[PDB]
């Protein structure tokens, strides 16, 4: 049984989302529907993605480094490799383990990309003991086509390129080819302007061709888990949610065991979330997507008042998940 | 039952160690014994540590940054805070969530510290929408005393300082107080030419609170660490007290009823050739019946894990083990 997968701590600070590695604080309904495969597991113990269920490092040993500058000094470093070139990755060759499943957002100095996934790391050659010191910086990472000359964002893995561009200047850029990329897997959100939205929007998510999509069933609507993720802006400048398909502990549990016997298609495994006032049910589909009986609502659900989580059991997907939330109570 | 906590995938691919977030490939016995509290959970659903059961970004906003040297550029950036100053951390104020439980290894440019814990990040001022860009670099993070003038390693939290120093030069150093440290939780091992450390951290390098329970031999049973392959800068192994999935499971539920002190929950690990028993204490430490042997057990040929149930800690855990395709 998958009942163990979700317990109160998972939604009360133990749990981090599977995309940004930020602490989960809210549930975000997605009536429009969405698709996710990276670091996302199904009840069949499988992923259509390219990443293990952890946030370690993103490494690719065979990429091409370039920069566009009149001068070598103070340029934005660029690196890219073709999707499907990550031969060192056991899970999939589409991209290096932990590479973010978001479409690349193109930008030029002195601007920073809106709603970009950003990580810390740099250019590292396989033959070298250390990364090129001059290149270590915050980098936006994304999927794109047309690198390096005509970058375009893409949400389809096939024919894509895995690209990285520093959002802040590196003291000296490099043109080395081939050369490696090393970036930490836990990301921050780059925004020039204070937005309030959530990232990524469904249109930004990159998936493989076979990836199953999440769509509303009756009054039940797919949800993403909203996390607190640090935001990075204009340098030298005085100073919101990140969303993931699954809580990481759930993702890890699904990876560990095959749950085919427990659930059948047309069924959701259900848990009840109890708040100081009221309660709601959320359901997990066979494809690993979570649902709430929120219908058309896009309002974020605050987890601050969450008191308890307990299993309900397998239930028909067609049956409306309970949504009975009444402010704030000390109870 | 805690039987569910350990399954074959945890030790054969999926499992990542709780210290480095590397992929677990082996079991390393520690005859001398050791202690660990950070990102370590017991069967009472508790930690003596300062970290959540995940690799949370290391964020401390009230630290002091400075650098030492001839000029403001190509200098090693330094940041420090007193242990017990992590007020924003709900778990403990000892250190920021995800700060490594390793004693700081002092070093001078152009050298990289031997067996240092290294993470990527930079100085970030709270009033600023971005980090000080000149400072993003790889940093050694550790517990020390004497900051910033006379750094010395320490394995005790009391009177300690949580410290960071870049192992490679920063474009331009910064002097600010207070200012934040922002470093990713997953770490890389710093290895200098020569030195040749077999695995890190060694027991004498681990930082713990005064209240942390020690892991010591019980009969022929010896406490073990989980060995993982960790990216290195400068075959070297990174070790953690627990597989993270186990740490997460322990955090999720209270297993106090399940086991009694002086008892181990036991599983049998079946290998292509031979088998062995592994036990988990109430303190959350893992044991093998290796006695004084220090052989790295290769989990590559592990084929199955099955629960045995509670057994007295004193009773010997069975140990019955070239290269085989099979």
Residue numbers in the entry:
A (entry chain B): 238 to 433, 435 to 477, 484 to 570, 575 to 579
B (entry chain A): 238 to 471, 483 to 569, 575 to 579
Text from the published report:
In this study, we used cryoEM methods to reconstruct the structure of the RHDV capsid to an overall estimated resolution limit of 6.5 Å (5.5 Å in the shell domain) and solved the crystal structures of the S and P domains of the RHDV VP60 protein both at 2.0 Å resolution. The asymmetric unit of the crystal contains a dimer of P domains. The P2 sub-domains of RHDV, NV, SMSV, and FCV exhibit no obvious sequence homology, and the Cα coordinate r.m.s.d between the P2 sub-domain of RHDV and that of NV, SMSV, and FCV are 3.00 Å (38 Cα), 2.68 Å (123 Cα), and 4.32 Å (107 Cα), respectively. We identified seven regions of high sequence variation in this sub-domain that dictate the binding specificities of histo-blood group antigens. When we superimposed the crystal structures of the RHDV and MNV P2 sub-domains, we found that the L1 and L5 loops of RHDV correspond, respectively, to the two loops in MNV. The crystal structures of the S and P domains of VP60 were docked into the high-resolution cryoEM map to construct a pseudo-atomic model of the complete RHDV capsid.
The etiological agent of RHD is rabbit hemorrhagic disease virus (RHDV), which has a single-stranded, positive-sense, polyadenylated RNA genome of ∼7.5 kb. Mature RHDV virions are spherical, non-enveloped particles with a T = 3, icosahedral capsid whose outer diameter varies between 32 and 44 nm and whose structure is defined by characteristic, cup-shaped depressions. The only capsid protein present in RHDV, VP60, is composed of three domains, which include the N-terminal arm (NTA), the shell (S), and the protrusion (P), the latter of which is further divided into P1 and P2 sub-domains.
